[PDB]
mmCIF file of C-alpha atoms and ligand atoms in Angstrom:
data_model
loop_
_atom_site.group_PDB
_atom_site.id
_atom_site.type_symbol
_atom_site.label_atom_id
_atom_site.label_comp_id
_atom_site.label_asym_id
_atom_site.label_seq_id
_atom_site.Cartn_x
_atom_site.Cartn_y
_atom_site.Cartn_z
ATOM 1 C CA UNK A 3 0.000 0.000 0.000
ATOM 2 C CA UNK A 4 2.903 2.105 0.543
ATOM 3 C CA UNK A 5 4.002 2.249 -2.972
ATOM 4 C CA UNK A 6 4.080 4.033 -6.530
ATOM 5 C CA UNK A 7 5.932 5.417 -9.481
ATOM 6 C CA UNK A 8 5.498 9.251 -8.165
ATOM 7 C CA UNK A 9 8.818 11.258 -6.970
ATOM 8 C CA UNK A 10 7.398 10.890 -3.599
ATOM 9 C CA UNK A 11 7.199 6.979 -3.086
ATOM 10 C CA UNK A 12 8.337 5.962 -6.929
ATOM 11 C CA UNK A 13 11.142 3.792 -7.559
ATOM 12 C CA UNK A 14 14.152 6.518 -6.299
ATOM 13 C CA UNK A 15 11.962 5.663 -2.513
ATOM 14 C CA UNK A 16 11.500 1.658 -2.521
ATOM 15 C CA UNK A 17 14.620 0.983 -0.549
ATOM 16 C CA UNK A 18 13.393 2.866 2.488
ATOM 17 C CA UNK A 19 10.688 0.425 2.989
ATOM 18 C CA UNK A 20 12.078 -2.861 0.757
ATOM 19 C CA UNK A 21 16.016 -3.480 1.146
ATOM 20 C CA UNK A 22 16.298 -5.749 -1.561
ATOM 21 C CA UNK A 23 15.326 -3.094 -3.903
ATOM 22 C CA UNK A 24 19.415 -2.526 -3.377
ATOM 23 C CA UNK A 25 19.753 -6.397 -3.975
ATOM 24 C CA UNK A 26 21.935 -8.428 -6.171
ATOM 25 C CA UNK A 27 19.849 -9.514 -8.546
ATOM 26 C CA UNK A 28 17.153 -6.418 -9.498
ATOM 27 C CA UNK A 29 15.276 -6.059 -12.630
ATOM 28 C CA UNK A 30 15.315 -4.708 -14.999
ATOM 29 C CA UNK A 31 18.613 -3.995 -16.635
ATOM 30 C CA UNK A 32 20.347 -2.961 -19.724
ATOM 31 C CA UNK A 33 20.968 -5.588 -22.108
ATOM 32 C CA UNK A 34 24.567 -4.990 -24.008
ATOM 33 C CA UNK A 35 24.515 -7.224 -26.850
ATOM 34 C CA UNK A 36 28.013 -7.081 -27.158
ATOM 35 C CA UNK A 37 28.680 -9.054 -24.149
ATOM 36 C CA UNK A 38 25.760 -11.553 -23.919
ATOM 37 C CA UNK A 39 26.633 -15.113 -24.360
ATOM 38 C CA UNK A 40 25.946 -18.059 -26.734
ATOM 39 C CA UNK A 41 24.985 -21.232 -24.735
ATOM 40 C CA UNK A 42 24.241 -24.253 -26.756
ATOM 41 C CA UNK A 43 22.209 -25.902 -24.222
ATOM 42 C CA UNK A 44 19.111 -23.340 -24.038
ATOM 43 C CA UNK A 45 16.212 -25.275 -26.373
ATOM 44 C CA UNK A 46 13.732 -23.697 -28.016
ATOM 45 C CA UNK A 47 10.615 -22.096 -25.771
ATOM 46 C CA UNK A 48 7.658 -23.926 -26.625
ATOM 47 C CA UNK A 49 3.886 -22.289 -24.781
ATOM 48 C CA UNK A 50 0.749 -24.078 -24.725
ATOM 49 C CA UNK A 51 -1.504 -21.995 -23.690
ATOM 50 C CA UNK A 52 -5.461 -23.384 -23.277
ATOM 51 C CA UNK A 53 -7.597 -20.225 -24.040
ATOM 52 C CA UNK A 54 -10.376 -21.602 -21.450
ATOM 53 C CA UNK A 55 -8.017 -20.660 -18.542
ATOM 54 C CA UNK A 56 -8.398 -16.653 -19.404
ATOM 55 C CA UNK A 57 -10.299 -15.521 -16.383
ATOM 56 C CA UNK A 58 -10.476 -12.230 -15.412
ATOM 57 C CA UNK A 59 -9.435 -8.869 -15.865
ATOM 58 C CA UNK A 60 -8.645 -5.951 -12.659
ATOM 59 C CA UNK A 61 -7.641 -2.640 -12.154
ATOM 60 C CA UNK A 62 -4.579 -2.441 -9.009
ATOM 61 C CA UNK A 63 -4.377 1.169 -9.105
ATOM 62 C CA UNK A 64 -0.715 1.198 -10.558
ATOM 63 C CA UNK A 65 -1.653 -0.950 -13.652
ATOM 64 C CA UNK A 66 -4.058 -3.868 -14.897
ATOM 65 C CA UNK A 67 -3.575 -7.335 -14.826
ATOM 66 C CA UNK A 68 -5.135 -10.464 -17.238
ATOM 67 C CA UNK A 69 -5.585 -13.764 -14.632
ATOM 68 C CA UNK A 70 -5.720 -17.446 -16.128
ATOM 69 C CA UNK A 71 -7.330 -20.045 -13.732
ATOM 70 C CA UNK A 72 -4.002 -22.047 -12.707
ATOM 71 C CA UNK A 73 -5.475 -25.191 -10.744
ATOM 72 C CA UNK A 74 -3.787 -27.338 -13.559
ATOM 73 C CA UNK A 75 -1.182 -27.701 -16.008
ATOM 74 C CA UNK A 76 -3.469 -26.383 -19.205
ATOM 75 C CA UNK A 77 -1.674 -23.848 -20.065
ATOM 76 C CA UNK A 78 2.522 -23.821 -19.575
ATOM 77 C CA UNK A 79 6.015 -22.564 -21.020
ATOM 78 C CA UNK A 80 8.480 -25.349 -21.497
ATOM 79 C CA UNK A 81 11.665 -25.353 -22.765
ATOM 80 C CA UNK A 82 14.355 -22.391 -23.160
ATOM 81 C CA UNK A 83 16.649 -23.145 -19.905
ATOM 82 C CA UNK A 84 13.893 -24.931 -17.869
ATOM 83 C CA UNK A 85 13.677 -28.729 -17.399
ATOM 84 C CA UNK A 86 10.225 -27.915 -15.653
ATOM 85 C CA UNK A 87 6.974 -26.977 -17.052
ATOM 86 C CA UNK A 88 5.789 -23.370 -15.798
ATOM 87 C CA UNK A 89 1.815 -23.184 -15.188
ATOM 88 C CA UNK A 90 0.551 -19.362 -16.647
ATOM 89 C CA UNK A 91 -1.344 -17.046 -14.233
ATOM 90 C CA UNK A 92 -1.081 -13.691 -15.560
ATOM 91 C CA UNK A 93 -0.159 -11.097 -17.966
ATOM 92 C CA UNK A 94 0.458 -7.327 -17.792
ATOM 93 C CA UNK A 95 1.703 -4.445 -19.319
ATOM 94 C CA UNK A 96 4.452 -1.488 -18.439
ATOM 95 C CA UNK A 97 4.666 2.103 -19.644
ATOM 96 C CA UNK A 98 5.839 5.168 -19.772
ATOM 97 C CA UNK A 99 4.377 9.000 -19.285
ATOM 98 C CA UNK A 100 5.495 9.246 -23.262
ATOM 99 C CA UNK A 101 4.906 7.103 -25.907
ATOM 100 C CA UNK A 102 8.625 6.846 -26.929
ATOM 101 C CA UNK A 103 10.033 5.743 -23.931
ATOM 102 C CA UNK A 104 8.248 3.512 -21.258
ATOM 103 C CA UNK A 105 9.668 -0.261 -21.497
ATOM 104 C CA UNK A 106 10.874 -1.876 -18.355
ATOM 105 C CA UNK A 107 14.582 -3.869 -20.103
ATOM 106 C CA UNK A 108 16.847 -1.446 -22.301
ATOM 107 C CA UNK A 109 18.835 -2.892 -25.472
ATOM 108 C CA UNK A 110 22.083 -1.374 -25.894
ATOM 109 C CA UNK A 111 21.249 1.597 -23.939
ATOM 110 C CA UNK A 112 17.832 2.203 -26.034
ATOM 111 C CA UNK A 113 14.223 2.415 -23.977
ATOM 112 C CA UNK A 114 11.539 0.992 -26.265
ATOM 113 C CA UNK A 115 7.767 2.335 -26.253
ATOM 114 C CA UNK A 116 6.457 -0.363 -23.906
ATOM 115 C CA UNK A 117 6.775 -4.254 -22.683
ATOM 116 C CA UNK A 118 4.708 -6.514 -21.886
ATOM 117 C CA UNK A 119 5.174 -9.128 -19.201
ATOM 118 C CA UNK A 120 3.598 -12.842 -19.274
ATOM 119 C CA UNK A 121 4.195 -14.308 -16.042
ATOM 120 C CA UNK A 122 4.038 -18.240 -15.190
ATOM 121 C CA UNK A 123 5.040 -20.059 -11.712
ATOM 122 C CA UNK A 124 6.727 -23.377 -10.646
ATOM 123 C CA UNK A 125 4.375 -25.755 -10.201
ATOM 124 C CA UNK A 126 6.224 -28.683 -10.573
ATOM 125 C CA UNK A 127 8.542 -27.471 -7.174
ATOM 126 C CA UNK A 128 5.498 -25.454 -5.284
ATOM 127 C CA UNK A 129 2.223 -25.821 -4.212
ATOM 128 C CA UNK A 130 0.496 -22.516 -5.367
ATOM 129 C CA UNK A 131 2.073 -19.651 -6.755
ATOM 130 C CA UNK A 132 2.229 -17.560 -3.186
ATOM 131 C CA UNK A 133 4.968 -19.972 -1.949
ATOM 132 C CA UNK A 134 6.559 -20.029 -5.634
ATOM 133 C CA UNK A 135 6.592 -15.697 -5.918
ATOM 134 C CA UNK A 136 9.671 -15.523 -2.664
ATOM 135 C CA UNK A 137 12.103 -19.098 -4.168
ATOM 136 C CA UNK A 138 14.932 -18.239 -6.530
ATOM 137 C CA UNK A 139 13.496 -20.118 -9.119
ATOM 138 C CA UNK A 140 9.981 -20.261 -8.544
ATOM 139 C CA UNK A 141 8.740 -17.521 -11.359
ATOM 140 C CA UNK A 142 9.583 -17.160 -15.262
ATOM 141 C CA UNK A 143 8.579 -14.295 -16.939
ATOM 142 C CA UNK A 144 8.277 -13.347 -20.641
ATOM 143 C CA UNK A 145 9.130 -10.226 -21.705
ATOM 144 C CA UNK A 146 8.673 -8.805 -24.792
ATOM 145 C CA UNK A 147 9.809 -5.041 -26.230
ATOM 146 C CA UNK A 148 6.759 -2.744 -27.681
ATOM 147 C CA UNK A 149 7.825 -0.355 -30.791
ATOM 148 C CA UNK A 150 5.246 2.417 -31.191
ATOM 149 C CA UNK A 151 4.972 2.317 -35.131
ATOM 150 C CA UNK A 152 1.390 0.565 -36.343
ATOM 151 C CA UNK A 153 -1.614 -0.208 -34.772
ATOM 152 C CA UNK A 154 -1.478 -3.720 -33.462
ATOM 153 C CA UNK A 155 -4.899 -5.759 -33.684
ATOM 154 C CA UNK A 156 -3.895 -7.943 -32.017
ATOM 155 C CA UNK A 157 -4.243 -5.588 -28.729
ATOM 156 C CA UNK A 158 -7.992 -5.311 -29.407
ATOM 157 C CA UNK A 159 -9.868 -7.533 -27.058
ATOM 158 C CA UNK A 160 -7.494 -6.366 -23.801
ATOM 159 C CA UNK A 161 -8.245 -2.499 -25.052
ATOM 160 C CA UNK A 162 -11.746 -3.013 -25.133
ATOM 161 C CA UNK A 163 -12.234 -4.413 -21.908
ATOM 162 C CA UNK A 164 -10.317 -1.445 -20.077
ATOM 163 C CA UNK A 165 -13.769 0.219 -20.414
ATOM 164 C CA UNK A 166 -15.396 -2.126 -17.505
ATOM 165 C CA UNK A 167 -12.490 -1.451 -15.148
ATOM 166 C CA UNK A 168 -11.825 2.166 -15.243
ATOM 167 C CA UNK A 169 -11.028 2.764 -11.475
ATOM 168 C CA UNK A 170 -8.951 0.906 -9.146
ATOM 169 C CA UNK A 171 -10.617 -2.604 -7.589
ATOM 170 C CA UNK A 172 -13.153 -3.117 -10.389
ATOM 171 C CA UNK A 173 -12.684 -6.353 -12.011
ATOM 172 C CA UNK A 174 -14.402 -8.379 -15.005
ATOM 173 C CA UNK A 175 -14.723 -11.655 -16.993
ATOM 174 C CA UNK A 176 -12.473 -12.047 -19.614
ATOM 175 C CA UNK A 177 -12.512 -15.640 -20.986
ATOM 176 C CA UNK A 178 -11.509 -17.272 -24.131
ATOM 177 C CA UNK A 179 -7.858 -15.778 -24.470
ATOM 178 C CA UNK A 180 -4.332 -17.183 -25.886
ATOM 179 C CA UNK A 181 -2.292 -14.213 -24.871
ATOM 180 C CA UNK A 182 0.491 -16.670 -27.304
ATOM 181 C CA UNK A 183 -1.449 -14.514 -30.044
ATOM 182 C CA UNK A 184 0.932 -11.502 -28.186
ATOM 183 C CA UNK A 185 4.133 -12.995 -28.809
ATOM 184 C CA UNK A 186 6.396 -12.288 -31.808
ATOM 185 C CA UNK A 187 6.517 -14.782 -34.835
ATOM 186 C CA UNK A 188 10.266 -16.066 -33.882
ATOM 187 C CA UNK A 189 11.075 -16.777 -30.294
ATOM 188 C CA UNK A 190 14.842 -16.240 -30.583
ATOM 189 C CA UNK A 191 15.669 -14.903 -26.507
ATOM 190 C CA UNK A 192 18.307 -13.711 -23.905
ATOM 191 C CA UNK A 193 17.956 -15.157 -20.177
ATOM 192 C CA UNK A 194 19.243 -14.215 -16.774
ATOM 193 C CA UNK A 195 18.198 -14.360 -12.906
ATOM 194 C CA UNK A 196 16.353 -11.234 -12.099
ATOM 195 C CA UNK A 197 13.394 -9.648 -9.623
ATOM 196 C CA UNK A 198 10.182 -8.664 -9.538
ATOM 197 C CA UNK A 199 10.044 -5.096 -11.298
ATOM 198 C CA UNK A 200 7.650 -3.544 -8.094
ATOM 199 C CA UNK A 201 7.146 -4.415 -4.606
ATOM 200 C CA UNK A 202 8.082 -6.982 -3.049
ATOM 201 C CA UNK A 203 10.512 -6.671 -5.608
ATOM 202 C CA UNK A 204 11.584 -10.614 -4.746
ATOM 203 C CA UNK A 205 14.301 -12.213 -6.589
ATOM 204 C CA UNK A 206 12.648 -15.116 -7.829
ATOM 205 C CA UNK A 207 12.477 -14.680 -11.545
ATOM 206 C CA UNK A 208 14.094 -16.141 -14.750
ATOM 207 C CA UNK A 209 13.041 -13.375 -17.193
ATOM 208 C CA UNK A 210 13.036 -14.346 -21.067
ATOM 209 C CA UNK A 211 13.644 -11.560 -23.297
ATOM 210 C CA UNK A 212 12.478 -11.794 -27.033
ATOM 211 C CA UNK A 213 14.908 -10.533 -29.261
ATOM 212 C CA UNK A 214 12.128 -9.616 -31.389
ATOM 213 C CA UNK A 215 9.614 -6.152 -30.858
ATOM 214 C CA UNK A 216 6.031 -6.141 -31.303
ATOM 215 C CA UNK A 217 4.256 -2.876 -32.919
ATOM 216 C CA UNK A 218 1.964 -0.990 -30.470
ATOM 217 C CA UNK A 219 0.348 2.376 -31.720
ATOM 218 C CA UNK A 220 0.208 5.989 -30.026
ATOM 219 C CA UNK A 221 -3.679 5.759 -29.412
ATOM 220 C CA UNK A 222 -2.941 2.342 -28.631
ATOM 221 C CA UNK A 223 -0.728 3.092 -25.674
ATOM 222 C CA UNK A 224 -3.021 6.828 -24.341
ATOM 223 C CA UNK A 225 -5.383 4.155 -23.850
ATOM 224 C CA UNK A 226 -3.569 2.492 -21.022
ATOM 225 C CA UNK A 227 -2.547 6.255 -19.967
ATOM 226 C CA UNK A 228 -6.464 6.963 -19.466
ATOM 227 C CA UNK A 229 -6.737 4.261 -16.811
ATOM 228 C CA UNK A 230 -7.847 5.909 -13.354
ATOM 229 C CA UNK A 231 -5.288 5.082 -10.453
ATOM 230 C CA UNK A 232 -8.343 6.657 -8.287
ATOM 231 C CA UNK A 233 -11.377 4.253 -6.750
ATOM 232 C CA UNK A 234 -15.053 5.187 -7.970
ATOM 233 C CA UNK A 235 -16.231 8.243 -7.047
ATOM 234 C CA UNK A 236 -13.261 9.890 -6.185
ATOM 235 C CA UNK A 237 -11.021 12.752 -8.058
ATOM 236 C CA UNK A 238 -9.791 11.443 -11.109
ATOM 237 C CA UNK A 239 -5.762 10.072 -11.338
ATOM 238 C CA UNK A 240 -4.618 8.477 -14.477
ATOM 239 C CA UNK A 241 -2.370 6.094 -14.392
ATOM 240 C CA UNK A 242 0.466 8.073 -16.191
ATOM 241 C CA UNK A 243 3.520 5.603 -15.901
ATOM 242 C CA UNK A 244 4.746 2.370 -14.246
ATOM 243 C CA UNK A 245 8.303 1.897 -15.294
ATOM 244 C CA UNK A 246 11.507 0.834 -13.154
ATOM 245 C CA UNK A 247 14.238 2.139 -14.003
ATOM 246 C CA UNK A 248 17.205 -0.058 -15.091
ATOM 247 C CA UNK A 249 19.264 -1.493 -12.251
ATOM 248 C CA UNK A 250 22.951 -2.446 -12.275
ATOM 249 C CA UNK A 251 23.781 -5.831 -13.084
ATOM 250 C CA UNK A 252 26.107 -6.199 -10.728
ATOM 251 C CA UNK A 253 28.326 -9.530 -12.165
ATOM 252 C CA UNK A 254 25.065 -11.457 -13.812
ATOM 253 C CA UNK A 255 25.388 -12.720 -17.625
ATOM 254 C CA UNK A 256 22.731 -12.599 -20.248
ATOM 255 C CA UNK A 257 22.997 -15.468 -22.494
ATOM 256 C CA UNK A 258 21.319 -15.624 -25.940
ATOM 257 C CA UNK A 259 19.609 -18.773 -27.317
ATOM 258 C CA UNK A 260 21.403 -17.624 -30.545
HETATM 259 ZN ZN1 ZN B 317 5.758 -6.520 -15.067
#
């Protein structure tokens, strides 16, 4: 509760109230493709994804989050460095106050538009993902750069439903989703041991990065920007920005699957 992106308890803050958020193993970070490394034993990512698992859709007040029913193993990300499968339960989406630079991970020193962030958790280790979200390998998260160029229709069906959860705490049914539909066409990645980008900021994540950007338009992205931070009722807020900045690597490698 004791949290946002504003100058006055935004990411510069976080360490005051979460330590780690001067930890080892933060995310995100830059990613300097001259000094990632080739490892022969990643294999290919493969997602199954059962479009009967998308469940709901809720405004959090700092963003909005897509939920998939995870009771089962219907939906999971296998491959890349994992030996286990990885059960889906949500996707999201970062941003920035302009349209040009708003992505979480930097390439070469260069902020994209946006990025969006499919999360999954160990089930073949854990019980439920609350036990999973605090063990060093208990999360794996997709992320994947956002260019603003075209309009991507493939956005439509999460931009229309913003309109039934305008202010924090409402939620709504959203069913009969493959967020795989979001991903780009070749699944070439770079890997390494990060955090949670936000409160509780754990480090319990194996982040995939696709080497490969997705289009996103302007109207496209002041879309998320008109989401109200506020509850109903209440002054209006818009949810302006919910970017980390990068944080040092501090020894880690990134290793590319190519
Ligand atoms: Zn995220």
């Amino acid at each position: 509760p004791d949290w946002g992106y504003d100058d006055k308890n935004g990411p510069e803050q976080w360490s005051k109230l979460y330590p780690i958020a001067n930890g080892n193993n933060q995310s995100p970070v830059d990613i300097k493709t001259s000094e990632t490394k080739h490892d022969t034993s990643l294999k290919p990512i493969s997602v199954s994804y059962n479009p009967a698992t998308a469940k709901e859709i809720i405004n959090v007040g700092h963003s909005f989050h897509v939920n998939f029913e995870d009771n089962d193993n219907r939906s999971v990300l296998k491959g890349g460095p994992f030996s286990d499968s990885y059960r889906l339960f949500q996707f999201h989406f970062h941003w920035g106050s302009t349209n040009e630079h708003g992505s979480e991970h930097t390439v070469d020193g260069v902020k994209y538009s946006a990025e969006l962030h499919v999360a999954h958790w160990n089930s073949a280790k854990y019980s439920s993902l609350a036990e999973a979200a605090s063990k060093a390998d208990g999360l794996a998260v997709i992320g994947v750069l956002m260019k603003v160029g075209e309009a991507n229709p493939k956005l439509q069906k999460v931009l229309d439903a913003l309109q039934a959860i305008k202010t924090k705490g409402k939620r709504a049914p959203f069913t009969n989703f493959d967020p795989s539909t979001l991903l780009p066409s070749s699944l070439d990645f770079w890997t390494y041991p990060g955090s949670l980008t936000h409160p509780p900021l754990y480090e319990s994540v194996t982040w995939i990065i696709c080497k490969e950007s997705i289009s996103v338009s302007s109207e496209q992205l002041a879309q998320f920007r008109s989401l109200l931070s506020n509850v109903e009722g209440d002054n209006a807020v818009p949810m302006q920005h919910n970017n980390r900045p990068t944080q040092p690597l501090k020894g880690r490698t990134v290793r590319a699957s190519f």
